[PDB]
Amino acid sequence: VAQNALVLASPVVLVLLLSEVFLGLLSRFAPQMNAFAISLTVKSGIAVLIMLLYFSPVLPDNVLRLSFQATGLSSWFYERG
């Protein structure tokens, strides 16, 4: 479930992280910006907006794909006598 967790949270954590260092390069270009305070105001709108693009066509079919089906019941059990 962890490798299903990381690839499902894959696309939204890359843009939020790349935006922070892009903001961090502007703090190196303007020293007293205090971009840590600015990072909290702007990220909650960004972190929700990019996931709206693939919320409709991508999320609900993985839910039906990941439902555990009865055919795999042989691989998890065996009777002992």
Binding site: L52, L53, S56, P57
Partner: protein, 184 residues
């Protein structure tokens, strides 16, 4: 040398001359480069030419498809906006495939848009079709109405033979002779 239209297109100019040559008047096409084409007629045939402009609703505007309102380059598309782009692309492909039959000059195909069948838990409705065609003069056009209905019958999931309507007609009489230049 009174002009009546200017700034036209290339497709706009061959249709207006096809209309005016039916009514025994002769027009001239003048290229203006980047500004489009232009059409001038003589002086005594100017009163009659204005009457035929209002009737045919000329010049013709370009034909519209449903997938022109819903472009593919949209950044987010609802599932409501994908089956409308899908049925509009099948009827653009079905129209070119009907033009490769024997005798057909032009054709147009419409599909019934039932897209809200997925809102509730009910099974979807049937799909209805309607087609038009213009055939070559001299053909027994009574026997060619059950063949287009048979070809169109199993291009979908399940249709009936009374959900399809074919309305066809032979073509008009040919116009081959020149109109004739007037004298004053």
């Amino acid at each position: 040398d009174k002009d009546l239209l200017k700034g036209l297109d290339q497709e706009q100019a061959n249709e207006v001359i096809a209309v005016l040559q039916m009514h025994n008047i002769e027009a001239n096409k003048i290229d203006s480069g980047k500004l489009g084409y232009s059409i001038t007629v003589a002086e005594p045939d100017f009163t009659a030419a204005v009457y035929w402009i209002k009737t045919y609703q000329l010049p013709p505007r370009p034909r519209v498809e449903i997938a022109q309102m819903f472009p593919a380059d949209s950044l987010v598309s609802s599932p409501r906006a994908e089956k409308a782009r899908l049925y509009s692309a099948i009827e653009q492909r079905l129209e070119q495939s009907l033009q490769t039959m024997e005798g057909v000059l032009s054709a147009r195909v419409h599909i019934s848009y039932d897209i809200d069948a997925g809102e509730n838990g009910r099974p979807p409705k049937p799909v209805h079709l309607s087609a038009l065609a213009v055939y070559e003069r001299g053909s027994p056009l009574a026997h060619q109405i059950s063949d287009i209905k048979r070809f169109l019958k199993n291009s979908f999931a399940d249709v009936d033979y009374d959900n399809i309507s074919v309305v066809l007609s032979e073509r008009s009489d040919a116009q081959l002779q020149a109109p004739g230049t007037p004298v004053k």
